[PDB]
């Protein structure tokens, strides 16, 4: 499974763009004009799908606010869509990486059936893919110096 | 060239479907019509199924959900599938949801190509499609289900 490549795709086309907006703009502005100088990114790696009725975050996501962030990238204007949540005077860009949704589907809907008695072994392999994804995401953030803008959190560590 | 995700999908979806087809002598429609020559068409998409510019964005809602019951190692079990009856043939049709993360990368992330690496990333991700197909075919042949199943990469059709 291409976990490191999926982490690079996700970082370079979502996470870094978001960081570049936060840095260039001095935070994310709410629609009323309120700028949040304390704008950070929270990346949560879920176990089950967020839409699963037995998921921790099945309701949280409805509280998010969609924003279109504009930023400059190598001198050219670009934009990206993020989901935000304000807490304690701080703005959080929150994302469950959809590039992992295939494994989330395996965890919610296929592994619990365990027809061939191998689900424990399979599930260990898939969780190691989540570990390599998180590892690569942190290394890329550190490479670019965005490690204080980004927290990556595995659901198992909640 | 093996995929664990393919093995999970095969063992918990494809093989259950095949065991119903074999045990039932085909899949029955709601009117009771039994389609003896019931087959499975597994389509490996490039874009998401919901993507507005995907071949199969429209096809999907023409399908009818069916609960297949079957016996597995002495216990009664079931699996839910989506069927299409066309020209006297019943096809179980599935876009493996275990591949949706790669479909999301291909539809929603790679076209932005911020760092001009999308072409290389896309070659690497397509490797996962090839390994998925290889694994499904190998497991289907192992179990003698290879004539029940057709695995189609979008790149080939």
Numbering used by the authors:
A (entry chain A): 158 to 315
B (entry chain B): 159 to 315
Anything the authors wrote about it?
A recent groundbreaking study discovered the ancient origins of the cGAS-STING pathway in bacteria, which play a similar role in the immune system to combat bacteriophage infections. Binding of cGG to bacterial STING causes it to oligomerize into long filaments and activates the nicotinamide adenine dinucleotide (NAD)+ cleavage activity of its fused N-terminal Toll/interleukin-1 receptor (TIR) domain. In this study, we demonstrated two distinct mechanisms underlying the regulation of bacterial STINGs and a structural basis for cAA recognition and oligomerization.
The major α-helices of one ligand-free RiSTING protomer, α1, α3, and α4, have “anti-parallel” orientations with α1’, α3’, and α4’ helices of the other protomer, respectively, henceforth named “anti-parallel dimer”. The anti-parallel dimerization is mediated by α3-α3′, α3-α4 loop-α1′, and α1-α3′-α4′ loop interactions, forming an extensive interface of approximately 1400 Å2. The anti-parallel dimerization of RiSTING results in the sealing of half-site of the ligand-binding pocket of one protomer via interaction with the α3-α4 loop of the other protomer, preventing ligand access to binding pocket. Superimposition of anti-parallel RiSTING with cGG-bound RiSTING revealed that the bound cGG will cause severe clashes with the side-chains of Y262, N266, and L267 and the main-chain backbone of residues Y262-P269 of anti-parallel RiSTING. In the absence of a ligand, the conserved arginine residues R233 and R235 of anti-parallel RiSTING moved away from the ligand-binding pocket, accompanied by the extension of the β-strand, further hindering the recognition of CDNs. As a result, the anti-parallel dimeric architecture of ligand-free RiSTING is considered as an inactive state of bacterial STING owing to deformation of the ligand-binding pocket at the dimer interface. The anti-parallel dimerization of bacterial STING prevents ligand access to the binding pocket and thereby keep itself consistently in an inactive state, whereas the V-shaped dimer is ready to bind cognate ligand.
